[PDB]
CSV table of C-alpha atoms in Angstrom, one decimal:
chain,number,residue,atom,x,y,z
I,20,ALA,CA,0.2,28.6,33.5
I,21,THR,CA,2.1,29.0,36.8
I,22,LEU,CA,-0.1,31.7,37.8
I,23,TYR,CA,-3.1,30.4,37.2
I,24,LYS,CA,-3.7,29.1,40.5
I,25,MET,CA,-2.6,33.1,41.9
I,26,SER,CA,-5.2,34.5,39.6
I,27,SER,CA,-7.6,31.9,40.7
I,28,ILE,CA,-7.5,33.3,44.1
I,29,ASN,CA,-7.3,36.5,43.4
I,30,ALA,CA,-10.6,35.9,41.0
I,31,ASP,CA,-12.3,34.5,44.7
I,32,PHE,CA,-10.8,37.4,46.5
I,33,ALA,CA,-12.4,40.0,43.8
I,34,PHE,CA,-16.2,38.2,44.0
I,35,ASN,CA,-15.8,38.3,48.0
I,36,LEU,CA,-15.0,42.3,47.9
I,37,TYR,CA,-17.9,41.8,45.2
I,38,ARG,CA,-20.1,40.6,47.5
I,39,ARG,CA,-19.5,42.8,50.3
I,40,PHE,CA,-20.2,46.3,48.1
I,41,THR,CA,-23.4,44.5,47.3
I,42,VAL,CA,-24.2,44.9,50.8
I,43,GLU,CA,-22.6,47.9,51.0
I,44,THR,CA,-24.7,49.5,48.5
I,45,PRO,CA,-28.0,47.0,47.3
I,46,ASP,CA,-29.2,47.2,43.8
I,47,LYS,CA,-26.8,50.0,42.4
I,48,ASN,CA,-23.8,49.6,39.6
I,49,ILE,CA,-20.6,48.1,41.4
I,50,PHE,CA,-17.1,48.6,39.1
I,51,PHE,CA,-14.0,47.7,40.8
I,52,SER,CA,-10.5,46.6,39.4
I,53,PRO,CA,-9.7,43.8,42.1
I,54,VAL,CA,-6.2,42.9,40.4
I,55,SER,CA,-5.6,46.7,41.3
I,56,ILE,CA,-7.0,46.1,44.6
I,57,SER,CA,-4.8,43.0,45.3
I,58,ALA,CA,-1.6,44.5,43.8
I,59,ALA,CA,-1.4,47.4,45.8
I,60,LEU,CA,-2.0,45.5,49.0
I,61,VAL,CA,0.6,42.7,48.7
I,62,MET,CA,3.1,45.8,47.6
I,63,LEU,CA,2.0,47.1,50.8
I,64,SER,CA,2.5,43.6,52.8
I,65,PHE,CA,6.0,43.6,51.0
I,66,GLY,CA,7.6,45.8,53.6
I,67,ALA,CA,5.0,44.1,56.6
I,68,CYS,CA,6.6,41.4,59.2
I,69,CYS,CA,4.9,39.1,61.3
I,70,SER,CA,0.9,39.4,62.1
I,71,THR,CA,0.6,42.5,60.2
I,72,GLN,CA,1.8,40.7,56.9
I,73,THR,CA,-0.3,37.9,57.3
I,74,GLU,CA,-3.2,39.4,57.6
I,75,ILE,CA,-2.4,41.0,55.0
I,76,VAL,CA,-1.9,38.4,52.4
I,77,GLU,CA,-4.7,36.1,53.9
I,78,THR,CA,-7.2,38.9,53.6
I,79,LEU,CA,-6.3,38.8,50.0
I,80,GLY,CA,-7.1,34.7,50.3
I,81,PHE,CA,-3.9,33.3,50.4
I,82,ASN,CA,-3.5,30.2,52.2
I,83,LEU,CA,0.3,30.1,54.1
I,84,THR,CA,0.7,26.5,54.4
I,85,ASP,CA,-0.3,26.3,50.6
I,86,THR,CA,2.0,28.9,49.6
I,87,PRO,CA,4.4,30.3,52.1
I,88,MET,CA,4.7,33.7,51.9
I,89,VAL,CA,7.8,33.7,49.8
I,90,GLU,CA,6.0,32.4,46.7
I,91,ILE,CA,2.8,34.8,46.9
I,92,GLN,CA,5.7,37.9,46.7
I,93,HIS,CA,7.2,35.9,43.7
I,94,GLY,CA,3.9,35.0,42.1
I,95,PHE,CA,2.6,38.9,42.0
I,96,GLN,CA,5.6,40.2,40.8
I,97,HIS,CA,5.7,37.5,37.5
I,98,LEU,CA,1.9,38.6,37.6
I,99,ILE,CA,2.1,42.2,36.9
I,100,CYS,CA,5.1,41.5,34.4
I,101,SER,CA,2.9,39.1,32.7
I,102,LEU,CA,-0.1,42.2,32.4
I,103,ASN,CA,2.8,44.3,31.3
I,104,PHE,CA,4.2,42.6,29.1
I,105,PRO,CA,3.3,43.9,25.5
I,106,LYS,CA,1.1,42.7,23.1
I,107,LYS,CA,-0.4,43.7,19.6
I,108,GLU,CA,-3.8,45.4,19.8
I,109,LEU,CA,-4.4,45.7,23.5
I,110,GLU,CA,-3.8,48.3,25.8
I,111,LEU,CA,-2.8,47.2,29.2
I,112,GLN,CA,-0.9,48.7,32.0
I,113,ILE,CA,-0.8,47.6,35.5
I,114,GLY,CA,1.6,50.5,38.0
I,115,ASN,CA,2.2,52.0,40.9
I,116,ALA,CA,3.6,54.8,42.7
I,117,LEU,CA,5.1,55.8,45.9
I,118,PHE,CA,4.9,58.8,47.2
I,119,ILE,CA,7.5,59.3,49.9
I,120,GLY,CA,7.7,62.0,52.9
I,121,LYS,CA,10.3,64.5,53.1
I,122,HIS,CA,11.4,63.1,56.7
I,123,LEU,CA,10.1,59.4,56.1
I,124,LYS,CA,13.0,56.9,57.0
I,125,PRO,CA,12.2,54.3,53.9
I,126,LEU,CA,15.1,51.4,54.0
I,127,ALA,CA,17.1,51.6,50.5
I,128,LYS,CA,16.8,47.9,50.1
I,129,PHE,CA,12.9,47.9,50.0
I,130,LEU,CA,12.8,50.7,47.9
I,131,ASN,CA,15.0,49.1,45.5
I,132,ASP,CA,12.8,46.0,45.6
I,133,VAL,CA,10.0,47.4,44.5
I,134,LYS,CA,11.3,49.5,41.9
I,135,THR,CA,13.1,46.6,40.6
I,136,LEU,CA,10.5,44.2,40.9
I,137,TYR,CA,7.1,46.1,41.4
I,138,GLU,CA,7.3,48.3,38.6
I,139,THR,CA,6.8,51.6,41.5
I,140,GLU,CA,7.7,54.9,40.5
I,141,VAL,CA,9.2,56.5,43.6
I,142,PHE,CA,8.8,60.0,44.6
I,143,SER,CA,9.6,62.7,47.1
I,144,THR,CA,6.8,64.6,48.1
I,145,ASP,CA,6.4,67.4,50.7
I,146,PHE,CA,3.3,67.0,53.0
I,147,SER,CA,3.4,69.5,54.6
I,148,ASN,CA,1.3,71.5,51.8
I,149,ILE,CA,-1.2,68.6,51.8
I,150,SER,CA,-3.4,70.4,49.1
I,151,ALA,CA,-0.3,70.8,46.3
I,152,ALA,CA,0.5,67.2,47.6
I,153,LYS,CA,-2.7,65.7,46.5
I,154,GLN,CA,-3.0,67.4,43.5
I,155,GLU,CA,0.2,65.9,42.6
I,156,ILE,CA,-1.2,62.6,43.3
I,157,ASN,CA,-4.3,62.7,41.7
I,158,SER,CA,-2.7,64.5,38.4
I,159,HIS,CA,-0.3,61.4,38.5
I,160,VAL,CA,-3.5,58.9,38.3
I,161,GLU,CA,-4.3,60.5,35.7
I,162,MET,CA,-1.6,60.7,33.2
I,163,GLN,CA,-1.3,56.7,34.3
I,164,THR,CA,-4.9,56.0,33.5
I,165,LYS,CA,-4.9,58.1,29.8
I,166,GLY,CA,-6.9,60.9,31.7
I,167,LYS,CA,-9.5,58.3,33.0
I,168,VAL,CA,-9.1,58.0,36.8
I,169,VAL,CA,-9.7,61.7,37.8
I,170,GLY,CA,-9.2,63.1,41.1
I,171,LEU,CA,-8.6,59.7,43.1
I,172,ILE,CA,-8.0,60.8,46.3
I,173,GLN,CA,-11.2,63.6,47.6
I,174,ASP,CA,-9.5,64.2,50.7
I,175,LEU,CA,-5.7,63.4,52.2
I,176,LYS,CA,-5.1,63.6,56.3
I,177,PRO,CA,-3.0,66.5,57.0
I,178,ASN,CA,-0.4,64.2,58.9
I,179,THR,CA,0.0,61.9,55.7
I,180,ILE,CA,3.8,60.6,55.5
I,181,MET,CA,3.6,58.3,53.0
I,182,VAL,CA,0.6,57.3,49.9
I,183,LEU,CA,1.2,54.0,47.9
I,184,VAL,CA,-1.2,54.1,44.6
I,185,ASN,CA,-1.4,51.5,42.1
I,186,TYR,CA,-3.0,52.0,38.7
I,187,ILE,CA,-4.8,50.3,36.2
I,188,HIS,CA,-5.4,51.2,32.1
I,189,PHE,CA,-7.0,48.8,29.7
I,190,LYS,CA,-8.3,49.4,26.1
I,191,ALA,CA,-8.9,46.7,23.8
I,192,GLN,CA,-11.1,46.1,20.0
I,193,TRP,CA,-14.1,43.8,20.1
I,194,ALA,CA,-12.6,40.2,18.1
I,195,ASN,CA,-16.0,41.5,16.3
I,196,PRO,CA,-16.9,45.3,16.4
I,197,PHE,CA,-20.3,46.9,16.6
I,198,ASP,CA,-21.7,48.7,13.4
I,199,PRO,CA,-22.6,51.8,14.1
I,200,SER,CA,-25.2,52.2,11.6
I,201,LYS,CA,-27.3,48.9,13.3
I,202,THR,CA,-27.3,50.9,16.8
I,203,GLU,CA,-30.3,52.0,18.0
I,204,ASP,CA,-30.0,55.1,19.1
I,205,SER,CA,-32.6,55.2,22.0
I,206,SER,CA,-33.7,51.5,23.7
I,207,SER,CA,-34.8,51.0,27.0
I,208,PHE,CA,-33.1,49.2,29.4
I,209,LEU,CA,-34.8,47.8,32.6
I,210,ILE,CA,-33.3,48.9,35.9
I,211,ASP,CA,-36.0,48.0,38.1
I,212,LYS,CA,-39.5,46.1,37.6
I,213,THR,CA,-41.2,49.1,36.9
I,214,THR,CA,-38.5,51.8,35.8
I,215,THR,CA,-36.2,52.0,32.4
I,216,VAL,CA,-33.9,53.9,30.9
I,217,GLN,CA,-33.1,54.4,27.0
I,218,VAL,CA,-29.5,54.3,26.0
I,219,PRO,CA,-28.1,53.3,22.3
I,220,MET,CA,-28.5,49.8,22.0
I,221,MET,CA,-25.7,47.7,19.6
I,222,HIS,CA,-27.1,45.4,18.0
I,223,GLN,CA,-24.7,42.2,15.8
I,224,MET,CA,-25.3,38.9,14.8
I,225,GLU,CA,-21.9,36.9,15.1
I,226,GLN,CA,-20.5,33.4,16.8
I,227,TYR,CA,-19.9,33.9,20.5
I,228,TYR,CA,-18.9,31.2,22.9
I,229,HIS,CA,-22.3,31.3,25.3
I,230,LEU,CA,-24.4,28.9,28.0
I,231,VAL,CA,-27.3,28.8,29.8
I,232,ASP,CA,-26.2,27.6,33.1
I,233,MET,CA,-29.3,25.9,34.0
I,234,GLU,CA,-28.4,24.7,37.4
I,235,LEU,CA,-28.2,29.1,38.1
I,236,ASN,CA,-30.8,30.2,35.5
I,237,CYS,CA,-28.3,32.9,33.7
I,238,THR,CA,-27.2,33.2,30.5
I,239,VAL,CA,-23.5,33.9,30.1
I,240,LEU,CA,-22.0,35.1,27.1
I,241,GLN,CA,-18.3,35.8,26.6
I,242,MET,CA,-17.3,38.6,24.1
I,243,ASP,CA,-13.4,38.2,22.6
I,244,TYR,CA,-11.0,41.0,22.6
I,245,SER,CA,-8.9,41.1,19.2
I,246,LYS,CA,-6.0,39.8,21.6
I,247,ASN,CA,-5.2,38.3,24.5
I,248,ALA,CA,-8.5,39.5,26.3
I,249,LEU,CA,-12.2,38.7,26.6
I,250,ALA,CA,-15.7,40.3,28.6
I,251,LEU,CA,-17.7,37.6,29.9
I,252,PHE,CA,-21.8,39.1,30.3
I,253,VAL,CA,-23.6,37.3,33.1
I,254,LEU,CA,-27.4,37.8,32.6
I,255,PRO,CA,-29.4,36.4,35.0
I,256,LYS,CA,-33.1,35.1,34.5
I,257,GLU,CA,-35.9,37.4,36.1
I,258,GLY,CA,-35.6,37.5,40.3
I,259,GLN,CA,-32.0,35.3,40.5
I,260,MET,CA,-29.3,37.7,40.0
I,261,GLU,CA,-28.9,37.7,43.7
I,262,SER,CA,-28.9,33.6,43.6
I,263,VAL,CA,-26.6,33.7,40.6
I,264,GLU,CA,-24.4,36.7,42.6
I,265,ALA,CA,-23.7,34.2,45.7
I,266,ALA,CA,-22.8,31.4,43.3
I,267,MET,CA,-19.6,33.9,41.3
I,268,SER,CA,-16.9,32.3,42.5
I,269,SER,CA,-13.5,30.3,40.7
I,270,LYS,CA,-15.3,27.1,40.5
I,271,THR,CA,-18.2,28.7,38.7
I,272,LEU,CA,-15.6,30.6,36.2
I,273,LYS,CA,-14.5,27.3,35.7
I,274,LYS,CA,-17.7,25.2,34.7
I,275,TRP,CA,-18.7,27.8,32.7
I,276,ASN,CA,-15.6,27.5,30.7
I,277,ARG,CA,-15.6,23.8,29.8
I,278,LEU,CA,-19.4,24.4,29.1
I,279,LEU,CA,-19.2,27.0,26.6
I,280,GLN,CA,-19.8,27.0,23.2
I,281,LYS,CA,-19.1,29.0,20.0
I,282,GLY,CA,-22.3,28.9,17.9
I,283,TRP,CA,-24.7,32.6,16.2
I,284,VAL,CA,-26.1,34.8,18.6
I,285,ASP,CA,-28.8,37.7,17.8
I,286,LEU,CA,-26.4,40.2,20.2
I,287,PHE,CA,-27.6,43.5,21.6
I,288,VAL,CA,-25.5,45.3,24.0
I,289,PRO,CA,-25.8,48.3,25.5
I,290,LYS,CA,-23.6,51.9,24.6
I,291,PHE,CA,-22.8,53.3,27.8
I,292,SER,CA,-20.1,54.6,30.7
I,293,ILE,CA,-19.9,54.2,34.4
I,294,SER,CA,-17.6,54.7,37.0
I,295,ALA,CA,-17.5,54.0,41.1
I,296,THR,CA,-15.9,55.0,44.0
I,297,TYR,CA,-14.9,52.5,47.1
I,298,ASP,CA,-14.0,54.0,50.9
I,299,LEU,CA,-11.9,50.7,51.2
I,300,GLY,CA,-10.6,51.7,55.0
I,301,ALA,CA,-13.2,50.2,57.2
I,302,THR,CA,-14.4,47.4,54.9
I,303,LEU,CA,-10.5,45.9,54.6
I,304,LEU,CA,-10.6,46.0,58.5
I,305,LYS,CA,-13.4,43.8,58.6
I,306,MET,CA,-12.4,41.5,56.3
I,307,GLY,CA,-9.6,40.9,58.2
I,308,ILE,CA,-6.6,43.6,58.2
I,309,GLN,CA,-6.1,44.9,61.5
I,310,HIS,CA,-2.9,45.4,63.1
I,311,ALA,CA,-1.8,47.7,59.3
I,312,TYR,CA,-3.9,50.2,61.1
I,313,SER,CA,-3.1,49.5,64.8
I,314,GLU,CA,-0.1,51.7,66.4
I,315,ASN,CA,1.6,48.0,66.7
I,316,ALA,CA,1.8,48.0,62.7
I,317,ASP,CA,4.7,45.9,62.0
I,318,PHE,CA,6.2,47.3,58.7
I,319,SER,CA,9.9,46.6,59.6
I,320,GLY,CA,10.8,46.0,56.5
I,321,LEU,CA,9.3,49.5,54.9
I,322,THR,CA,11.4,51.9,57.0
I,323,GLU,CA,14.2,52.0,59.5
I,324,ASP,CA,11.8,53.2,62.7
I,325,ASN,CA,8.9,51.4,61.5
I,326,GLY,CA,7.2,54.6,61.7
I,327,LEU,CA,3.9,54.4,59.9
I,328,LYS,CA,0.8,53.0,59.8
I,329,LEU,CA,-2.3,52.8,57.5
I,330,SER,CA,-4.6,55.1,57.9
I,331,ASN,CA,-7.4,54.8,54.7
I,332,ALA,CA,-7.6,53.0,51.4
I,333,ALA,CA,-10.3,54.2,48.5
I,334,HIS,CA,-10.6,52.8,45.2
I,335,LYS,CA,-11.5,55.0,41.7
I,336,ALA,CA,-12.9,52.9,38.8
I,337,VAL,CA,-14.3,53.9,35.2
I,338,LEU,CA,-15.5,51.9,32.1
I,339,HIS,CA,-16.5,52.5,28.9
I,340,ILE,CA,-18.0,50.4,26.7
I,341,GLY,CA,-19.0,51.1,22.7
I,342,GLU,CA,-19.3,49.7,19.4
I,343,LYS,CA,-15.2,49.6,19.0
I,344,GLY,CA,-14.5,47.9,22.3
I,345,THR,CA,-14.1,48.6,25.6
I,346,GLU,CA,-11.9,51.4,28.2
I,347,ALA,CA,-11.6,50.7,31.3
I,348,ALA,CA,-9.7,51.9,34.3
I,349,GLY,CA,-8.8,52.1,38.4
I,350,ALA,CA,-6.8,53.2,41.2
I,351,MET,CA,-6.2,52.0,44.5
I,352,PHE,CA,-5.2,54.6,46.9
I,353,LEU,CA,-3.9,53.3,50.4
I,354,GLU,CA,-2.3,56.3,53.3
I,355,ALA,CA,0.0,56.1,55.9
I,356,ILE,CA,0.3,58.1,59.3
I,357,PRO,CA,2.7,58.2,61.4
I,358,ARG,CA,2.5,55.3,64.0
């Protein structure tokens, strides 16, 4: 319960980033892991100082008067630990890895801190062979996401001296799985006003927590996984997607948590897989992460010589929903070059 205020801030960051993405790619699939993005950037901030550090955590939604820097750091450590704590029937792992250039001068304190407190695996990497370094990192992320996130990094700058990656993998079974014998092989899904695509449409009638939001004109359906997780489906009325998107916030989630009521639903859900990628460099800059990218970047907590700056950031995430449950994964990439 001590983590709720932090997860609430992390959720509002999720919704604000989501809204940036709807501007970048309007009327298109969006899919990402906000916790992966938040966790990777907080970890980077652990080695930052002064405005370089404060910009990162403020961009993540934190208010330093409400929650001091050290409290944010300790809170995220507790969050990651709790997410990774084994729960029968749930596969959920969030981890990170640091690939350190052969000539980098990382502080021993920093490395021991992240290995012990942040789950981090640290690898010595020869970036002078940029093609092999990229393959090494991509294969590591692929392995850690159970094969689901392939080719996270498309290009790696030739002068790279450090890479930070975060990965998340989630696999869970529905509390009430669908019977594939009741799945319609080919059913219509409306992708715009006049256009359908065909998808298998799963079908069951069971009790679920659900509501119709009278203010936002959307249906909200909660589908439980068998252990410690749930999915929320938000289905706007015709023409209401934009207004629902505008309204999504932790405040809205809290309202819905009170209003959801469990009762019978005749439920049709599509079986499908999607993937999405994001080049986050300029987005994170616009959102307020400025000094990290500059020749005056302050990462004095990270290397002896304060020798690096952020150069690029990217995210990839994948989703599958089917009769048994859901499998999803994501990964965050942060690239550093000499300052």
